[PDB]
Design a protein around this ligand. Structure first.
Ligand SMILES: CCCCCCCCCCCCCCCCCC(=O)OC[C@H](COP(=O)([O-])OCC(O)COP(=O)([O-])OC[C@@H](COC(=O)CCCCCCCCCCCCCCCCC)OC(=O)CCCCCCCCCCCCCCCCC)OC(=O)CCCCCCCCCCCCCCCCC
Ligand SMILES: CCCCCCCCCCCCCCCCCC(=O)OC[C@H](COP(=O)([O-])OCC(O)COP(=O)([O-])OC[C@@H](COC(=O)CCCCCCCCCCCCCCCCC)OC(=O)CCCCCCCCCCCCCCCCC)OC(=O)CCCCCCCCCCCCCCCCC
Ligand SMILES: COC1=C(OC)C(=O)C(C/C=C(\C)CC/C=C(\C)CC/C=C(/C)CC/C=C(/C)CC/C=C(\C)CC/C=C(\C)CC/C=C(\C)CC/C=C(\C)CC/C=C(\C)CCC=C(C)C)=C(C)C1=O
Ligand SMILES: CCCCCCCCCCCCCCCCCC(=O)OC[C@H](COP(=O)(O)OCCN)OC(=O)CCCCCCCCCCCCCCCCC
Lengths: 318, 347, 175, 115, 99, 114, 83, 70, 98
């Protein structure tokens, strides 16, 4: 009973991103007064399947100047990294009870960017190399704030174990004690996953592509499903870390229902901001983090090292 | 480079070397080397000439390789001993790995083809700081670990340094290049006596520091970098080059100038250890060092060289820079032989 | 088969180590380092060093990212090399694979290798020690004491890294 | 065991999707369908020549700053000590130099992106 | 130390990590705590020259505990001889070492 | 360079107490107070002698005193204890925080009956 | 006052983030010395028994060391319950 | 209208609900009802190993109460 | 001294050999430089974890702190040599032969 457990995670995950593409357009359309897909099946409940099946039957082709090996492995890197990252998430009981679950997700999420430029570099295209070089410095600069924000919040945890967030915010939501860090955490998640106040990684307006430059039916599907899966989690990680929920040890279903609802609400907000703001220019999104987010990031860090000491509220290590 | 950053950059170098000479933990010694390397690379390329970039580069790969080998030799010593203290190395391979690991920092054996052109490319100011200060740290480590040193390897390290340093200097015109080979020659002299009496290499270090200092800031005052450019200084500054004779003679060890004190005192110590053939050898091959010293002496003011008519208004102007301890450094670099027994202060 | 993953993981570490040490194109060198770096994190994790394992994972990944981020910036070749490409890199590569595969063969067939030091093949599971750790992981408390027992190391490390930002700008500024 | 089985399943699942990606859709290709995309007209010849960006200075400071976050990572277990005064002073000390490095990097052009 | 400022200035900078039997956090002893404790207590103030000849077995026990060079060699011979003896068929492992 | 005097197998044949970890975790505080004397003596032998081969008998006394503690609990408060340790065992982390009510039954039972 | 107030107001207008960050950064250092619960944090960390309280041999003349865990003499941390 | 959006959420919410329910139930099923014991530290693992040895059937979750001793 | 020690020690040798055989690239040279750092970090981690040298578990961390510090220095030096000479092959900087 572990292969069943793993396949009880992989299939629901890929189906979650599957219909997230439907709740994207059907939400995007309604926010821009459109109606979204409602033709393929009732209320569009079959449109992504029609999209997916086409994207595994229309002619794929490697670029003539491609690097075959790196061109093929990049979708492998994107998809496997996205799936493997959901592993330590503590939905009532986590699938894999890592002692350092937080550090694990930081490490692999820092790896999901090797896919974007290995794809860009191997594609041997001018828009590919531009988009690849845009994205790398975009993510790592946004990664410095990602690491410190996680540390400052988790100083009240006493450990990096994801299961302990359930116990930590048992009575009080964590956001009520770290809301200033919550704002930059949400923005950074918008930036690591490349949603659209900082979707410059794709850069469709100015770079036409960059998530998947010449990538076709299969590899394009991966680089999409590898980033829409990150959309659902980076809000599941936000939900688990900031907005805790009651967890009865005898009936975990209530926690799973509550946990799913918070991810759904957060994911809608990811789609909500996506159609309410313009595109950050490159220097602006770098200036926002290196010149406005980081100074507040370090300052609130020093606050959260001192805060438990001044209030004698050092959390238990175990 | 702004003046304030330059000072803190220097202080980091002195702190890095100081960390090496006070720490008892191997990791801290490695850290002191790492800080020394890190704060020095910007110093070399202070003026940003094209030459300095690869001059600083050749510094970096050589010393980083030396630092990494030093770290590895430390690790094996920890593996076989479980100790970080600088007492001795309990694995012969660990020691036989550090000698070259420290040697490339010192630049003694064929781990020396970095010293000449790193001196050449960089300015004269950092050249002085490179050839004098950067040797206290690696030598200090060698002095502490002097107990468990393979004498066969360490002696060969120095013997190779004296031969190459003397031989290489005979075919150099750029004053910085001849200084580097001459410094390499003195490298072997200090390191040859290392296994026997560590007090002696400290004495030779102190004398060599004064020699290299006094020689260099004389070159700074002369504002010369090649033999021909130095030649004209007789027309403008006769006393500087006349003083340069005595320092050149002292640097060659020609007594009763102070430069003999190391060469003399060292030879006395090793003959106490029944080493006779080798002491005779560096006595012989110190002469090729003396050769290009005299050629420098011949070309500077022992024979006045053709001048340049653009020197009139040069004589109309005096130096504004203010080298200090230069009058002092010449005194220690020329006449301290009557105070030879003062080496016991180091002991 | 699950006898002891230490050798298998360290073997991929060496084969990945062979790769970028053969001087490929710099971008392909990053891949060769990353596989070794990732599996190296696996080796330390298997030995109980959970924090240090993921520690080298996160830092290096960011470290090598800016490495080959730089190579495509100003160190790229107009016709990049590959694992096969030139015979020199081909020769340097295949030399590494045949070398390591010779030592492991020399390692696993007598179990009394005496190159430089002594190396006897009996299983890295053996050197483990019997004993509990209470309610704390030993490695985590060891690196936690840096702020209590290692105040001297914090000062020298902090000052050096601060100087590290000074040199980087000062070197790269120019003119 | 558990962690490696999960790692294996993900890469097999990803690789299988590639295999059905490049084999299930059959190919009718030529030399013009493999041409690099340049928004229509012919490329002038690029995508591998040195494309020098400007944030190299801040790209490399990220590497320096990423080492700061490595140094201050063990803080959750550092608070469980008996000498918090020393721990607090040192913990803020690393943050101060991290702030100081950023501030000095800021003042001397630094974060500004070269033109 | 070359110039021992720690001894003169009377403070500690790195004389807390240089050995395994020092005050570790929360009194977590090292593997070879006793072996090195005897070795250091053996050669304390005796000098390096006398230490390398007198406190020799204490170092050998400590260095062995660090690597288990001989002990693992002993185990290697036990398994190899057991393997050939079992393979030939002289004797078979007793039921306690099967389950 | 000598011999190793491993004790007789017979000496390592004392009664082996058989209760699951949750049972011991439930007894915990009450066990610690009412069984400290043999416990402290045995570990002092462990710390002083630094050799379990010289302290087997003190280990035996712990087992015998552990049995008497558990023999008394069955005779008097077997049911509430069985209710309590079952409630601890369900939790994956065995926290006393979730079974206060069953604890309240247990301690009052041994207070007014043992 | 005039020089300082003009500077603070001007910075509060152009660069609100920097004057903000310098505030919490400033408070993060100076209150922990002033606040009186810092000693409690030391006591809580000290009172946590990770290791065994190894018994010490009773040769008599140790009145303060208890002979049983329930004995009144010894370090009592009832303050934790009240706190 | 906006309520037509909800079917997009519902088929995702149920899909995201499965991993939480499946993992919770599989652990209970594979450990005899009780939650899977977590061992974040060696001491927790030591209890688990002693449970495996004591149970006889080599099952850590199979627990023996007072009735094992007598 | 089991075979894992052989693997990473022999690994560091090829890092030493790889560095000392500059073929045509400074960037690939720096790769081998940071390569050495893996084996040293990994071996050091194995040592102080096996020996339970808990207070010395900080040593691999401090290695990494001074590790990337050199790595930054190498690329920063590589910035100008490639900037003002075009490429990074270590053959075009022989102007200091005289
Ligand atoms: C580390 C090991 C590196 C091994 C190696 O040589 O990799 C070359 C490999 C391919 O180089 P390339 O620049 O794509 O050139 C491929 C053809 O030469 C140029 O393109 P192509 O169209 O000729 O590609 C097809 C070609 C090459 O084969 C492939 O493209 C198949 C996939 C790569 C196989 C190698 O097929 C063959 O040569 C015949 C195969 C029978 O380069 C890599 O970086 C792959 C490393 C994979 C490491 C393990 C990852 C898990
Ligand atoms: C033996 C024991 C005694 C050793 C005695 C050392 C004697 C040094 C003689 C210097 C005389 C002045 C002269 O003509 O100087 C040339 C020369 C500077 O050449 P320059 O063209 O006149 O400089 C123009 C400025 O850079 C123009 O300024 P800037 O705008 O470029 O800004 C940079 C300036 C800023 O300066 C300041 O802020 C002051 O930097 C300096 O002035 C360099 C010194 C900085 C402060 C160092 C404090 C160390 C304590 O001096 C040096 O390069 C000094 C190097 C560093 C100190 C000596 C290190 C070597 C000794 C190591 C072994 C020690 C014993 C071991 C046993
Ligand atoms: C600028 O900004 C931008 C964005 O955003 C910021 C964007 O978003 C976008 C994106 C654009 C839009 C949203 C606009 C509209 C476009 C779309 C909606 C495109 C749609 C794209 C798709 C890819 C469609 C997705 C839809 C669906 C329905 C996907 C459905 C999924 C599947 C069919 C697959 C599901 C998974 C399955 C079936 C897995 C099956 C697995 C198994 C059977 C088990 C496998 C494993 C094992 C057997 C393991 C055991 C095996 C072992 C051990 C083998 C061992 C072997 C050995 C050798 C040892 C753009 C362009 C953009 O410009
Ligand atoms: C032995 C030392 C001397 C070795 C030989 C030196 C070269 C031969 C001597 C002539 C050098 C050329 C020259 O011009 O000499 C004179 C020079 C000063 O010349 P001038 O400036 O005219 O003197 C004004 C004095 N009120 O003044 C000098 O050259 C002074 C030489 C001093 C040499 C060093 C002495 C150190 C202490 C002993």
């Amino acid at each position: 009973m572990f292969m069943i457990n793993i396949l009880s995670l992989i299939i629901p995950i890929l189906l979650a991103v599957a219909f997230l593409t439907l709740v994207e357009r059907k939400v995007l359309g309604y926010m821009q007064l459109r109606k979204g897909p409602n033709v393929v099946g009732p209320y569009g409940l079959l449109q992504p399947i029609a999209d997916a099946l086409k994207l595994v039957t229309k002619e794929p082709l490697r670029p003539g100047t491609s690097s075959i090996s790196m061109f093929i492995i990049a979708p492998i890197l994107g998809l496997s990294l996205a799936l493997t990252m959901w592993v330590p998430l503590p939905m009532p009981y986590p699938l894999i009870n890592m002692n350092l679950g937080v550090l694990f997700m930081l490490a692999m999420s820092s790896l999901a960017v090797y896919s974007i430029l290995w794809s860009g570099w191997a594609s041997n295209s001018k828009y590919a190399l531009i988009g690849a070089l845009r994205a790398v410095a975009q993510t790592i600069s946004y990664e410095v704030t990602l690491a410190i924000i996680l540390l400052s919040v988790l100083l009240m945890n006493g450990s990096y174990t994801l299961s302990t967030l359930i116990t930590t915010q048992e009575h009080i939501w964590m956001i009520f004690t770290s809301w200033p860090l919550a704002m930059m955490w949400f923005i950074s998640t918008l930036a690591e996953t490349n949603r659209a106040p900082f979707d410059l990684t794709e850069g469709e307006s100015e770079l036409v592509s960059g998530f998947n430059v010449e990538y076709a039916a299969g590899p394009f599907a991966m680089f999409f499903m590898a980033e829409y899966a990150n959309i659902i989690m980076m809000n599941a990680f936000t939900a688990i870390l900031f907005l805790g929920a009651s967890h009865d040890p005898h009936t975990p279903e209530l926690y799973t229902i509550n946990f799913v609802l918070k991810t759904l609400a957060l994911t809608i907000t990811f789609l909500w901001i996506r159609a309410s703001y313009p595109r950050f220019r490159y220097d602006q999104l770098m200036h926002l983090l290196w010149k406005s987010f980081l100074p507040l990031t370090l300052a609130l860090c020093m606050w959260h090292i001192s805060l438990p000491i001044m209030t004698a509220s050092i959390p238990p290590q175990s | 480079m702004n003046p304030i950053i330059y000072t803190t950059l220097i202080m980091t170098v002195m702190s890095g070397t100081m960390l090496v000479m006070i720490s008892s933990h191997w990791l801290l010694i490695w850290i002191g080397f790492e800080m020394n390397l890190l704060a020095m690379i910007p110093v070399l390329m202070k003026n940003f000439n094209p030459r300095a970039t690869e001059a600083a580069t050749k510094y970096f790969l050589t010393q980083a390789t030396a630092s990494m080998m030093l770290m590895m030799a430390i690790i094996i010593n920890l593996l076989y001993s479980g100790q970080w203290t600088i007492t001795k190395m309990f694995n012969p391979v660990a020691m036989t790995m550090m000698t070259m690991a420290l040697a490339m920092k010192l630049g003694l054996s064929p781990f020396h083809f970095w010293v000449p052109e790193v001196t050449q490319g960089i300015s004269l100011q950092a050249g002085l700081l490179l050839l004098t200060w950067q040797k206290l740290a690696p030598l200090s480590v060698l002095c502490q670990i002097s107990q468990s040193i393979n004498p066969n390897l360490m002696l060969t390290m120095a013997m190779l340094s004296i031969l190459i340093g003397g031989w290489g200097g005979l075919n150099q015109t750029q004053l910085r290049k001849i200084m580097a080979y001459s410094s390499i020659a003195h490298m072997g002299w200090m390191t040859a006596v290392l296994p026997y009496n560590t007090t002696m290499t400290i004495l030779n270090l102190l004398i060599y520091i004064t020699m290299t200092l006094a020689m260099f800031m004389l070159l700074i005052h002369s504002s010369a970098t090649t033999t021909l450019s130095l030649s004209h200084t007789w027309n403008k500054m006769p006393v500087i080059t006349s003083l340069m004779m005595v320092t050149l003679l002292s640097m060659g060890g020609l007594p009763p100038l102070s430069g003999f004190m190391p060469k003399w005192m060292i030879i006395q110590e090793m003959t106490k250890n029944e080493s006779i053939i080798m002491p005779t050898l560096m006595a012989m091959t110190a002469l090729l060092n003396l050769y290009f010293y005299m050629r420098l002496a011949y070309s500077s003011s022992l024979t006045m060289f053709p001048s340049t008519n653009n020197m009139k208004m040069k004589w109309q102007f005096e130096h504004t820079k203010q080298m200090k301890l230069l009058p002092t450094m010449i005194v220690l670099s020329t006449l301290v032989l009557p105070m030879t027994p003062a080496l016991s202060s180091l002991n | 088969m699950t006898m002891y993953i230490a050798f298998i993981l360290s073997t991929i570490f060496v084969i990945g180590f062979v790769g970028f040490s053969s001087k490929p194109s710099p971008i392909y060198g990053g891949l060769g380092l990353i596989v070794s770096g990732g599996v190296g994190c696996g080796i330390v994790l298997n030995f109980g060093g959970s924090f240090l394992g993921l520690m080298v994972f996160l830092i290096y990944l960011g470290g090598m990212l800016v490495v080959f981020g730089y190579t495509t910036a100003m160190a790229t070749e107009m016709y990049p090399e590959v694992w096969v490409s030139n015979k020199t890199v081909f020769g340097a590569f295949v030399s590494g694979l045949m070398m390591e595969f010779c030592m492991v063969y020399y390692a696993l067939k007598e179990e009394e290798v005496e190159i430089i030091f002594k190396f006897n093949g009996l299983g890295d599971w053996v050197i483990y020690d019997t004993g509990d750790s209470g309610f704390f992981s030993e490695e985590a408390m060891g690196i936690a004491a840096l702020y209590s027992y290692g105040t001297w190391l914090v000062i020298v490390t902090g000052w050096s890294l601060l100087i590290g930002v000074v040199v980087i700008m000062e070197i790269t500024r120019g003119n | 065991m558990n962690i490696m089985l999960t790692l294996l399943t993900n890469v097999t699942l990803a690789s299988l999707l590639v295999l059905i990606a490049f084999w299930l859709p059959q190919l009718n290709a030529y030399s013009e369908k493999t041409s690099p995309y340049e928004c229509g007209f012919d490329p002038m010849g690029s995508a591998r020549l040195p494309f020098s960006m400007k944030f190299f200075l801040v790209a490399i400071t990220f590497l320096l700053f990423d080492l700061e976050i490595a140094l201050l990572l063990p803080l959750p277990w550092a608070s469980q000590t008996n000498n918090l005064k020393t721990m607090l002073t040192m913990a803020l000390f690393l943050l101060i130099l991290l702030a100081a490095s950023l501030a000095y990097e800021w003042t001397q052009k630094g974060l500004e992106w070269a033109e | 130390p070359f110039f021992d400022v720690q001894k003169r200035l009377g403070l500690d900078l790195d004389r807390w990590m240089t050995i395994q039997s020092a005050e570790q956090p929360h009194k977590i002893p090292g593997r070879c705590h006793a072996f090195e404790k005897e070795w250091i207590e053996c050669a304390h103030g005796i000098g390096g020259i006398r230490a390398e000849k007198e406190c020799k077995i204490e170092f050998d026990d400590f260095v062995e505990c660090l690597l288990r060079q001989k002990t693992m060699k002993r185990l290697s011979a036990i398994k190899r001889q057991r393997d050939k003896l079992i393979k030939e068929g002289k004797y078979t492992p007793p039921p306690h070492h099967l389950g | 360079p000598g011999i190793v005097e491993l004790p007789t197998l017979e000496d390592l044949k004392v009664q082996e107490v058989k209760v699951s970890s949750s049972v011991l975790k439930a007894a915990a505080h009450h066990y610690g107070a009412q069984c400290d004397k043999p416990n402290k003596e045995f570990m002092l032998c462990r710390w002083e002698e630094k050799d379990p081969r010289r302290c087997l008998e003190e280990g035996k006394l712990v087992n015998q005193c552990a049995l008497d503690f558990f023999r008394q609990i069955k005779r008097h408060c077997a049911e509430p204890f069985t209710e309590y340790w079952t409630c601890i065992d369900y939790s994956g982390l065995q926290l006393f925080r979730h079974c206060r009510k069953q604890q309240a039954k247990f301690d009052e039972c041994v207070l007014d009956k043992l | 006052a005039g020089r300082i107030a003009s500077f603070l107001k001007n910075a509060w207008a152009k660069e609100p983030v920097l004057v903000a960050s310098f505030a919490i950064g400033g408070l993060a250092i100076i209150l922990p010395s002033l606040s009186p619960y810092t000693n409690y944090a030391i006591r809580i960390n000290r009172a946590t028994p990770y290791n065994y309280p190894v018994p010490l041999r009773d040769d008599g003349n140790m009145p303060d060391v208890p002979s049983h865990p329930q004995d009144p003499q010894g370090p009592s941390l009832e303050w934790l319950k009240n706190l | 209208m906006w309520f037509e959006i909800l079917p997009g959420i519902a088929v995702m919410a149920a899909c995201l609900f499965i991993p939480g329910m499946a993992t919770a139930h599989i652990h209970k099923f594979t450990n005899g009802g009780k939650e899977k014991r977590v061992a974040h530290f060696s001491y927790q693992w030591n209890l688990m190993e002693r449970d495996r040895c004591i149970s006889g059937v080599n099952r850590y979750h199979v627990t023996k109460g007072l009735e094992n001793i007598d | 001294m089991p075979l894992v020690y052989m693997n990473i020690i022999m690994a560091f040798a090829i890092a030493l050999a790889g560095l000392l055989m500059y073929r045509s690239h400074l960037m690939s040279s720096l790769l081998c430089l940071e390569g050495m750092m893996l084996s040293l970090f990994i071996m050091s981690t194995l040592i102080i974890l096996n020996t339970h040298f808990t207070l010395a578990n900080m040593m691999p961390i401090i290695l990494l702190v001074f590790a990337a510090c050199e790595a930054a220095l190498g690329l920063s030096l590589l910035v100008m040599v490639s900037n003002t000479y075009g490429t990074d092959y270590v053959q075009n900087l022989n102007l200091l032969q005289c």
